[PDB]
Design an enzyme around this catalytic site. Structure first.
Site, mmCIF file in Angstrom:
data_model
loop_
_atom_site.group_PDB
_atom_site.id
_atom_site.type_symbol
_atom_site.label_atom_id
_atom_site.label_comp_id
_atom_site.label_asym_id
_atom_site.label_seq_id
_atom_site.Cartn_x
_atom_site.Cartn_y
_atom_site.Cartn_z
ATOM 1 N N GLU A 168 -20.426 10.392 74.883
ATOM 2 C CA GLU A 168 -20.491 11.705 74.259
ATOM 3 C C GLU A 168 -21.714 11.760 73.352
ATOM 4 O O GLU A 168 -21.765 11.071 72.327
ATOM 5 C CB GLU A 168 -19.217 11.999 73.468
ATOM 6 C CG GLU A 168 -18.692 10.815 72.670
ATOM 7 C CD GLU A 168 -17.862 11.238 71.476
ATOM 8 O OE1 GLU A 168 -17.735 12.458 71.240
ATOM 9 O OE2 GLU A 168 -17.338 10.350 70.770
ATOM 10 N N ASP A 193 -16.768 7.404 70.265
ATOM 11 C CA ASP A 193 -16.678 6.947 68.889
ATOM 12 C C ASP A 193 -15.319 6.302 68.627
ATOM 13 O O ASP A 193 -14.582 5.937 69.546
ATOM 14 C CB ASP A 193 -16.905 8.110 67.925
ATOM 15 C CG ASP A 193 -18.285 8.720 68.061
ATOM 16 O OD1 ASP A 193 -19.263 7.956 68.202
ATOM 17 O OD2 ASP A 193 -18.393 9.963 68.027
ATOM 18 N N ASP A 241 -13.506 7.824 65.856
ATOM 19 C CA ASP A 241 -12.926 8.821 64.972
ATOM 20 C C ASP A 241 -11.944 9.698 65.751
ATOM 21 O O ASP A 241 -11.550 9.384 66.876
ATOM 22 C CB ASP A 241 -14.031 9.648 64.319
ATOM 23 C CG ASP A 241 -13.650 10.143 62.940
ATOM 24 O OD1 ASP A 241 -12.437 10.237 62.657
ATOM 25 O OD2 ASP A 241 -14.561 10.440 62.140
ATOM 26 N N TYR A 254 -27.384 31.708 43.938
ATOM 27 C CA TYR A 254 -27.455 32.614 42.799
ATOM 28 C C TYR A 254 -26.200 32.542 41.939
ATOM 29 O O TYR A 254 -26.288 32.292 40.734
ATOM 30 C CB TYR A 254 -27.688 34.055 43.272
ATOM 31 C CG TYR A 254 -28.988 34.259 44.008
ATOM 32 C CD1 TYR A 254 -30.199 33.911 43.428
ATOM 33 C CD2 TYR A 254 -29.006 34.814 45.278
ATOM 34 C CE1 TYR A 254 -31.389 34.100 44.098
ATOM 35 C CE2 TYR A 254 -30.190 35.005 45.956
ATOM 36 C CZ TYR A 254 -31.378 34.647 45.363
ATOM 37 O OH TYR A 254 -32.559 34.840 46.039
#
Lengths: 745, 745
Positions: free
Chosen positions: A23, A94, A96, A352
């Protein structure tokens, strides 16, 4: 199609060549680097008998094309499997949830649906790379564990980890170059074969098909050491265990991201946000920009998701307006964070507007001394947000919340603050007349006190029909000018969204001629002018029962307060409630027990601190004839302090009593040194500092015997402390509500 | 269309009506909140005489529709302008650069292009909200400045800012609700009209039309005090001033995000990343994940852009492979950060790969003691990354950098490290045989030493024809199989991109049977199987006389090195070079001046530290006869110390020589305190500590003498120090090259 063809692929040696499916281009690059080691890795895997493909629909079409598979065969016989272009397909993903759990489960489900015999014959395998590596200093070879259970068992076997560094590799890209070379030196040992199981036949349908919701009710159970040892002995992984662990963990993580807990009514990402706000603003509560605070949260508390979601959630936590999600926001938001119009998505950019911690409300709501006693989740061995928060009040039911889920819905309307306060005070007071009767209700599943929806910022009407509550807005009609002034919208309804919903229905504009929005930032004032003599047609068109009015239905001024009380359990899994009162009774015991937990922790740390401070004041008194200046170095001074009766104490642990529990405290505090005497500043020598020390010593003595008293409180230890905290938090809530949740004013 | 119709809009009193144009829904909500104050703000603006429109083509069509503007009419007469539906239009935009430059500038340009008479008549207006607000502690009324220059002048007029808190409002969303009410109280003052100037007509074509290039060659000039006073007194703003001071700044900032400064060869984002890495990994160089470090940079270095760009730039800074952008990466990257293929875009996920500071290279390439002296960019009154880094070697020419640009083009190929080292050593050594004529050539802008493109990681050929360099990949052709093996691609050419470029050409595919990528992580091995008897056709078809071979032309193995030397001036503006030695000559004086400044400040700090340490050791030697226990408090203890000759010293200044000029600490050393004696720990009174302090005093006295001697160095002060730093940088670079930029692995 991101496919690299092996030399022997599709040839007479097809049964030997493998197809590594990965992947992501990062995983593809790692596989290429491992395969191209050349003569530096003799007898290792190379492109002679290995091809590479990417899993990043049409991807499976490409895979079935390259592999030579067909949809009209079962491959039970040996010859059918021999006709394939590759001996086996190895998933290189992986470790995970997204990678290992989701992708691998999807691929396994596809294979099981189409060619289960391939899984039976072990045609599909996976690459089980080391998950945790412990490097001992002064050594080049690490200790590798493929599961957390092995690592923690080994750590329990070990005595100290000060000389070891623990590295977690949750993804394929986390491996370093030398680590990749080490893994590919023994590549054959990392290949694990997948075998079908009797339970897996229905597990695949459950996890990739209703009853899945039943399955996700309980938490994920980690594999026992026996199962891991059995897997490692034969290097075969039953797909049932993989589905029960990795896919279940992935689904539960998704649920936790979408559905909040019931102890604090707030999700994993929001828990990270609140814990980061508590950590950042504890030392100095000053305004920080939203993006700066998001960066702090991501850096310190492992918020690896997209920063846009982090900023959106921070703004949502800092939003305060009528109909907002949070009735008691944890952050004071300086700037413009949106209003009821647009439903709060009209906030300014994160660079902001600024946020600060609501210090009074947060301190009275989430005690600072109570954060040490919570269970914490660890991200790659680093501490993170607590597993759950236990506020002084059931925060899960005093704030609104709306969230869709995978077959679930989370919809909570805030209950009346007065009713909740009365219920908790009756439970904890032991003097309120309804205390014993409330206990009788709690242990017999009945209700004694009402729990009505909150209407603090709402200016409409809350009417209960049957078992369902309805919120009604307020309107005035002026036929003299043939127009309607909407003054109050239904609860939790955005202004512009309501206006566009009205404009969507062409039926209502058979009479409406113009709509304008003159509403203020807080109140609603919408001027809708109709066509002439439209009142008669509004009257005749809309028949309503006693629940609604013609104008109310014509303007859709009614909202139904649906409640879907589905939360996640503190120890994993989800629980679906049916009433707010049972949520309150479920929340109560955790708070009650953690109160006394804090009580004995405070008692122990008070004893240790008192001992240290008595030693310190004794040293201050005797420092006149104990001049360390004439002495040579550290060890001589420590030995002399030992010969003078001073006790060696771990002042770092005591003066800073972190998450360490009472057994660690009383087993490690006395095992220290004399740094506390040597770290004393010269300004502590003057007698004013000594007077301050002795008066604070008597203060902690008074606190100590008062804690001794409180530990024997009758309803439960700390009942009076709970009452005082309830009073403080209600005073803080009143102060915030008076000043529009803008404190310091 | 997000338009709130005013009550009198399009009526008889339309001339009194105004149309507030807001950029952003946050600005729209702020304007609505200000307008709907009602009776709380009597005689203020309201929806009776004000309407609201959203600016954030189609929106321009909406504006002309609502205003009733006619393209054919010119509105040069009073009646023509009276026919309009609104008296004037006010642009409510953020005081930042995006809003105001991009939005307000575009609106002004559009109006001037279509209806200049409206602008010259004052029909187009703007809302000038305060930019800086400074609050006096204990006072609820602040003092406001609409420009940074006036705030700076007021700060100069002030004596101390300890009791003053300064807040910057770069966006409309940054205003607090009470501030919004205060603003809308005097809203009539905050509206400024626009005046058309004859010179502004040229500027409109310049900024919205080739002349842009030699308009942006110089930096932006802030408005002078007299111009600001004239603008404020008459409340009229010329369009020429707005275009010169505001939209030019926006264009310059937009360009700076792409084209790097020639002093350090890094843009604003990369400079921020380097500063964050220096600040984070200074105390501890432990590995941090990419997302964690990005969060740290955003929190501390004021990186207000998206996290995706931040992570991508961090990855680019940490990448190291043949053809990578950075030949000397700032960060050591633990994990898979990409390869030659995919253009290095195949890096791992930011939540898996980790980064750390290349301390052995960075700490000498950018000295830590020199970062104190660089000019620093201040964001909203908070310090951020410096304006430019001055490395020991010219980094804008030793690393490859290419980027598409707006109105320009940036492409730079790394120069040979040996040539750069020889040039700088000749310049600084004063003993090299090439020093004198190099100094002469610096003044005469001629070349005396070669500067060839670097070929460290390149295995091809660097062939110069005419004035153009070309990179040639290496290939081998086997006739016994009729196949071509590409062993090295041209410089900075992605493998997959090259393969796709070859495959998209039908003529080249006419002879090639197939192409398969078998390349390693850092070694290119591309197999090309050809159709039979194709070699003759390649010989006769793609034949090239002398620049290329027929095979090279057929396989596109030659890449031209076009160098577009356009960099950002350290004081703003774009400077274009024609050769790399010009860049080196421009870079040298900055480094020399930095060395001299470092020597000066080091001498001052050494004198201060000598005084402070002499006082401390005198106190330590006189601590037995002067016990502070008998004394009462710190005030009388300091009085006694003064009576005994101990001088009051500002310990926080000498101990931490932060970003202060020599005059700053020279004048702040007059102010003093006795905390240095008071704050020393008890362990410092030991004999070993006293001996260490005396030895450090002697060593620092010797260092002060050495610095005094170095200040009088012949080529320029600090020439020997510069040479030593050059040697250290060369050693670090060699060590990193040996270990593949994986120091200590």
């Amino acid at each position: 199609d991101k496919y690299t063809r092996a030399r022997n692929a599709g040839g007479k040696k097809a049964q030997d060549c493998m197809l590594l499916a990965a992947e992501g281009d990062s995983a593809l690059s790692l596989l290429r680097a491992g395969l191209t080691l050349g003569k530096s890795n003799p007898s290792g895997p190379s492109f002679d008998f290995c091809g590479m493909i990417s899993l990043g629909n049409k991807v499976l079409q490409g895979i079935v094309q390259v592999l030579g598979l067909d949809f009209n065969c079962h491959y039970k016989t040996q010859e059918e499997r021999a006709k394939l272009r590759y001996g086996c397909i190895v998933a290189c993903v992986d470790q995970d949830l997204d990678g290992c759990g989701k992708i691998l489960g999807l691929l396994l489900a596809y294979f099981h649906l189409f060619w289960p015999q391939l899984i039976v014959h072990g045609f599909v395998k996976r690459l089980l790379t080391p998950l945790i590596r412990v490097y001992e200093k002064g050594n080049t070879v690490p200790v590798e564990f493929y599961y957390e259970q092995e690592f923690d068992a080994w750590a329990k076997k070990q005595t100290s980890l000060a000389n070891h560094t623990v590295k977690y590799y949750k993804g394929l890209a986390a491996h370093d170059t030398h680590e990749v070379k080490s893994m590919f030196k023994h590549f054959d040992k990392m290949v694990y074969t997948f075998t079908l199981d009797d339970s897996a036949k229905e597990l695949f349908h459950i996890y990739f098909g209703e009853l899945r919701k039943r399955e996700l009710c309980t938490g994920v159970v980690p594999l026992t050491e026996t199962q891991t040892q059995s897997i490692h002995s034969v290097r075969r992984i039953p797909c049932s265990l993989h589905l029960q662990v990795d896919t279940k963990a992935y689904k539960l993580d998704a649920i936790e991201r979408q559905i909040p807990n019931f102890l604090d009514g707030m999700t994993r990402a929001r828990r990270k946000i609140l814990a980061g706000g508590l950590k950042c603003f504890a030392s100095n509560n000053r305004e920080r920009k939203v993006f700066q605070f998001g960066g702090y949260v991501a850096d310190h508390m492992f918020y690896h998701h997209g920063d846009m979601s982090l900023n959106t959630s921070i703004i949502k936590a800092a939003q305060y307006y009528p109909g907002s999600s949070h009735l008691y926001p944890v952050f004071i938001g300086i700037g413009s964070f949106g209003s009821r119009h647009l439903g709060g998505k009209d906030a300014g950019s994160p660079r902001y507007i600024s946020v600060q911690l609501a210090s009074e409300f947060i301190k009275t709501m989430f005690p600072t001394e109570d954060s040490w006693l919570l269970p914490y989740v660890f991200e790659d061995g680093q501490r993170a947000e607590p597993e759950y928060y236990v506020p002084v009040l059931p925060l899960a039911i005093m704030e609104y919340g709306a969230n869709p889920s995978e077959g679930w819905k989370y919809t909570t309307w805030a209950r009346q603050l007065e009713d909740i306060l009365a219920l908790v005070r009756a439970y904890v007071d032991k003097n309120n007349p309804k205390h014993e009767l409330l206990h009788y209700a709690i242990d017999h599943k009945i209700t004694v006190l009402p729990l009505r929806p909150s209407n603090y910022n709402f200016k409409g009407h809350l009417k209960r029909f049957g078992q369902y509550y309805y919120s009604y807005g307020t309107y005035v009609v002026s036929e003299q000018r043939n127009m309607i002034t909407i003054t109050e919208l239904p609860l939790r309804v955005p202004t512009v969204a309501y206006i566009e919903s009205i404009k969507k229905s062409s039926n209502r504009m058979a009479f409406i001629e113009e709509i304008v929005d003159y509403s203020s930032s807080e109140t609603i004032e919408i001027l809708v002018k109709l066509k002439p003599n439209s009142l008669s047609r509004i009257m005749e068109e809309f028949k309503e029962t006693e629940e609604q009015n013609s104008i109310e239905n014509f303007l859709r001024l009614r909202n139904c307060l649906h409640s879907h009380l589905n939360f996640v359990k503190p120890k994993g899994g989800i629980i679906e409630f049916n009433s707010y009162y049972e949520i309150l009774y479920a929340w109560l015991p955790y708070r009650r027990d953690l109160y006394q937990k804090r009580l004995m922790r405070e008692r122990a740390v008070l004893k240790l601190r008192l001992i240290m401070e008595t030693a310190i004041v004794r040293y201050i008194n005797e420092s006149a004839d104990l001049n360390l200046s004439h002495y040579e170095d550290e060890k001589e001074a420590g030995r002399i302090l030992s010969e003078h009766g001073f006790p060696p104490l771990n002042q770092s642990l005591i003066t800073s009593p972190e998450f360490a529990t009472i057994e660690e405290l009383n087993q490690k505090a006395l095992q220290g040194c004399y740094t506390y005497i040597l770290s004393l500043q010269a300004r502590e020598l003057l007698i004013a500092a000594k007077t301050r020390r002795v008066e604070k010593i008597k203060k902690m003595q008074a606190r100590l015997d008062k804690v001794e008293q409180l530990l024997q409180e009758s309803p439960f230890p700390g009942a009076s402390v709970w009452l005082e905290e309830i009073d403080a938090v209600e005073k803080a809530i009143i102060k915030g509500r008076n000043t529009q949740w803008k404190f310091h004013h």
